[PDB]
Amino acid sequence: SVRGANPLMFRANVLHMLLEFVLDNLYLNRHTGFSQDHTPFTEGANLRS
Amino acid sequence: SVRGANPLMFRANVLHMLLEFVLDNLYLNRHTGFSQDHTPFTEGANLRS
Numbered sequence A, B: 001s002v003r004g005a006n007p008l009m010f011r012a013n014v015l016h017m018l019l020e021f022v023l024d025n026l027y028l029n030r031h032t033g034f035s036q037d038h039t040p041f042t043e044g045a046n047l048r049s
Helices: A007-023 B007-023
Strands: A034-036 A046-048 B034-036 B046-048
Antiparallel strands (some): A034 A046, B034 B046
């Protein structure tokens, strides 16, 4: 069945899933730049772009 | 909006304005001639022409 899955394989699958969840997130957070807020919504904070 | 200024930039703007107010007035007062006046109300005064 295409709509179905075998339960005894659940853990195996979930595990591998988490493994990719990690692999796919292995990056360094890069810094971009800002601009001061020209409105009064915030007290002149620096919003990242 | 074309019309309308931004209040948070008021002092900033005003200051600059005062700066030009000074710069535009940085001159020496030149001495020009006069004329001896005999109008009844300013009799004998030397008005600068």
